[PDB]
Amino acid sequence: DFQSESYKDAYSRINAIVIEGEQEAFDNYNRLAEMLPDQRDELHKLAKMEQRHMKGFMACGKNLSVTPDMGFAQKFFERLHENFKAAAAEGKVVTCLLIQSLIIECFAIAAYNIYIPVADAFARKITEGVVRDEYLHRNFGEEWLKANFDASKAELEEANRQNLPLVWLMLNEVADDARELGMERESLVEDFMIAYGEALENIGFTTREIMRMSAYGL
Amino acid sequence: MFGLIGHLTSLEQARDVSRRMGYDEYADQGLEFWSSAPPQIVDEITVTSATGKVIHGRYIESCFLPEMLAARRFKTATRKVLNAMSHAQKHGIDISALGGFTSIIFENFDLASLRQVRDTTLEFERFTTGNTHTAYVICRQVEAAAKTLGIDITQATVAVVGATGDIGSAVCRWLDLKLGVGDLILTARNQERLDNLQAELGRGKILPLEAALPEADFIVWVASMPQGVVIDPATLKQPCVLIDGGYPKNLGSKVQGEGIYVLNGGVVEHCFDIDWQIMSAAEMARPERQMFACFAEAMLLEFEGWHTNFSWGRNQITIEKMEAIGEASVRHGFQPLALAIE
Numbered sequence A: 001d002f003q004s005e006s007y008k009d010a011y012s013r014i015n016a017i018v019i020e021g022e023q024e025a026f027d028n029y030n031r032l033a034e035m036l037p038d039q040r041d042e043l044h045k046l047a048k049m050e051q052r053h054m055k056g057f058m059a060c061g062k063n064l065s066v067t068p069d070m071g072f073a074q075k076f077f078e079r080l081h082e083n084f085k086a087a088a089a090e091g092k093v094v095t096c097l098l099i100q101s102l103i104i105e106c107f108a109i110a111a112y113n114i115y116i117p118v119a120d121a122f123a124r125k126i127t128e129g130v131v132r133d134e135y136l137h138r139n140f141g142e143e144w145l146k147a148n149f150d151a152s153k154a155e156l157e158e159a160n161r162q163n164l165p166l167v168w169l170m171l172n173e174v175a176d177d178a179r180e181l182g183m184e185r186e187s188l189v190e191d192f193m194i195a196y197g198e199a200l201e202n203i204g205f206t207t208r209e210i211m212r213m214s215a216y217g218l
Numbered sequence B: 001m002f003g004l005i006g007h008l009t010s011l012e013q014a015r016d017v018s019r020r021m022g023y024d025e026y027a028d029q030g031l032e033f034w035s036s037a038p039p040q041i042v043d044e045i046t047v048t049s050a051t052g053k054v055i056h057g058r059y060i061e062s063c064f065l066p067e068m069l070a071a072r073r074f075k076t077a078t079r080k081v082l083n084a085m086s087h088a089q090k091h092g093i094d095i096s097a098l099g100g101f102t103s104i105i106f107e108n109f110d111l112a113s114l115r116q117v118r119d120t121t122l123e124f125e126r127f128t129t130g131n132t133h134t135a136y137v138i139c140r141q142v143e144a145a146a147k148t149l150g151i152d153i154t155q156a157t158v159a160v161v162g163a164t165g166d167i168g169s170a171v172c173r174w175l176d177l178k179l180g181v182g183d184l185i186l187t188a189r190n191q192e193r194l195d196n197l198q199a200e201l202g203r204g205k206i207l208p209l210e211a212a213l214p215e216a217d218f219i220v221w222v223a224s225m226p227q228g229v230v231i232d233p234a235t236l237k238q239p240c241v242l243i244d245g246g247y248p249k250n251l252g253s254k255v256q257g258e259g260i261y262v263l264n265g266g267v268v269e270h271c272f273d274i275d276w277q278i279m280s281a282a283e284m285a286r287p288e289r290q291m292f293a294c295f296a297e298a299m300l301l302e303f304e305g306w307h308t309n310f311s312w313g314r315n316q317i318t319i320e321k322m323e324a325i326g327e328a329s330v331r332h333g334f335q336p337l338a339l340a341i342e
C-alpha cells in the first residue's frame, strides 16, 4: 500500500477539506454560542474540541509529505459556509444547528469511520480519537432540537432540503480522490445516511419522515 | 421485543414495495441507491399466542438485494447485514431473525469476525437464523403432502436441493430418522460436504441437480440460489411434489402440469390475524395470517423467553432442537402451510 505519489496528491486536498471542515465547525460552534445564551459555555467546550481535532489533522499531513490545499477546501465548503453565514445573520438557530451538528458532524462521522480501516497507522490513531467526540457533538444538536422539536420541525425540514443536496455534490466532487485513499463513495453515503438518520430519529422524526428527508437530492 | 431482519427478492419488488407505503424517492432508484441505503425499522408488530401471551416486534429492512451477489457486490452485501444487525441491537431488540439471505451472507462471508460495527459489538445471542423452525416446518409439509396425495413416504424418494445447507441438512436428518423416507437424494454443489452428509446419515445417493429431479417423488428446494431455475414439468415423475422453500423461490417459473404439485415451503399460518403489511408485500396467500418459518422462530423464541441464538451457524441443527421449536410452534398457534386444492 505505497502511500506515496498520487496518494499524497489525493491526500493533498482531502487533508485540506478535513482541516477546513474542522475549522468551520470551530467557527460555527462559537457563533452558535453567540446565538443561544443559556448555553454558551457548553458550546465553547465543543468549539474547543474542534480546535484540537484541527491540529491533530495538520499532524497527519506533516507525518506524510503533505501540505494541504486550503484554497480548494474553502471552495469546497463555501456553499455550506454561505448557508450557515446567512442563517446566522438571520437568527435562524434551528437551521444553524442542522447545518453544523447534523449535516457537518455526520459528514465527519462517515468520513472518519471509512478512513480508519485504511489510514496509515499514525493517521488511524488520531482519527480513532476524534470520531468519539463527533458523536457527542451530534448529540448537542439532537437534544436541543429534540427539546424544541415542535417549534423547529418545519424549519428543520426546510433546512434539510436546502443543505442535504450539498452533501451529495461535495461527496461526488471529492469522490475520485477519496477512492484512491481506499474510500468507496458508496460506503461514505451509507455511513452518512446511517449517522444522519439516527440523529433525525432521536430528534423526533418518524421513519417515513426520515426516509423522505434523508434521500432528498439523491 | 423480537425483530425480523428481511430483504426483498429483486429490484423490481423493491420498487413496488417502495412504490407502496409512499416512498417515491426510494422506488425509482437502481442498484447503487440500495447499495448505500441504511437499514430501517419499517413496521411495528404485535402477535397474540394461542396461549394468550402478547409479544411485540419490529421489521427491519436490510436493503440487501439478491442482484448484489450476482453483481459480485460482496462487500455491499456484507454491509447490509452488519448494518441491519447493528440497527436491531441499537434499538434494544432482544431476538431477531436473519431472514433469507441475511443469514447466508453472515455464514458465507465469516461475518462473525466483523462483529465490530462502528460503535457496536454485535451480540450473537440476540439473533437467530430461524432455520431450525424452517426445517421442522418443511419436514411437516413433506409428511402432510404425502398423506394428502395418498403417497407412502416410507416408500418414496425425496430429493433435497441444497441438502448440505443449514436447512437442507436438518431436513435430511429429520426425513431420515423421524419420517423414515424410502430414499434420500442428496443434491449440492460442493462434493466434500455432500460426502460428509452421506456419511453422517449412513444413507443417501449423491446426484447432481439434473439427474436428481427425474428420480424424485418429492423435491425439497432449500438452495442458496440468488435467482431461481426453470424446471420443465416434462423432466419430473408423476406425481411429483415440489416444496420450494427458497427465498427467493428456487423455482424461477410456475412449474405446473398433470401430476405436479407445488407448495410454498417453510411457511406457517397463525390462528390469529397479525396486524402488519410486510407479509402482504411478501406475497403470501393470506398475508394477514401467513409468514416465513424463520420469522416465526423469532416470535416463538420471544413467546418462550428463549433469548438466545437458537439457530446459528451451519449444519448444527439437531432433531431435538427441531422437536423443541416444533412443539412450541404448535402450542402458540402456528401450523405448516398445506397444499392448496380445488
Ligand SMILES: NC(=O)C1=CN([C@@H]2O[C@H](COP(=O)(O)OP(=O)(O)OC[C@H]3O[C@@H](n4cnc5c(N)ncnc54)[C@H](OP(=O)(O)O)[C@@H]3O)[C@@H](O)[C@H]2O)C=CC1
Residues within 6 Å of the ligand: B100, B101, B103, B104, B130, B131, B134, B161, B162, B163, B164, B165, B166, B167, B168, B187, B188, B189, B190, B191, B193, B194, B209, B221, B222, B223, B224, B225, B245, B246, B247, B248, B265, B266, B267, B292, B293, B294, B295, B314
Ligand atoms: N422460512 C423460510 O422459508 C426460509 C427460507 N430460506 C431460504 O432457503 C434457502 C436455504 O437457506 P440456508 O440453508 O440458510 O442457506 P444455505 O446456504 O445454508 O443452503 C444452501 C445450500 O444449498 C446448496 N446450493 C446452493 N445453491 C445451489 C444451486 N444453484 N444448485 C445446487 N445446490 C445449491 C449449497 O450446497 P454447497 O455447499 O454444495 O454449495 C448450500 O449448502 C435460502 O436461500 C433462503 O432464501 C432459508 C431459511 C428459512
Ligand SMILES: *C(=O)CCCCCCCCCCCCCCCCC
Residues within 6 Å of the ligand: B005, B006, B007, B008, B017, B018, B023, B026, B042, B061, B098, B099, B100, B129, B130, B247, B277, B278, B279, B281, B282, B292, B293, B294, B295
Ligand atoms: C426466512 O428466512 C425468509 C425471510 C424472507 C426475508 C424477508 C421477506 C419478507 C419481508 C418483505 C416484506 C415487506 C418489506 C418492506 C421493505 C421496505 C423497503 C423500504
Ligand SMILES: CCCCCCCCCCCCCCCCO
Residues within 6 Å of the ligand: A014, A017, A018, A021, A022, A025, A050, A104, A105, A107, A108, A111, A112, A115, A127, A134, A174, A178
Ligand atoms: C480524514 C478522512 C477524510 C475523509 C474524506 C471524505 C470527504 C471529506 C470529509 C470532510 C469532513 C470534515 C468534517 C469536519 C467537521 C468536524 O466537526
Ligand SMILES: [Fe+2]
Residues within 6 Å of the ligand: A022, A025, A049, A050, A053, A108, A130, A134
Ligand atoms: Fe471535529
Ligand SMILES: [Fe+2]
Residues within 6 Å of the ligand: A025, A050, A105, A108, A133, A134, A137
Ligand atoms: Fe465536530
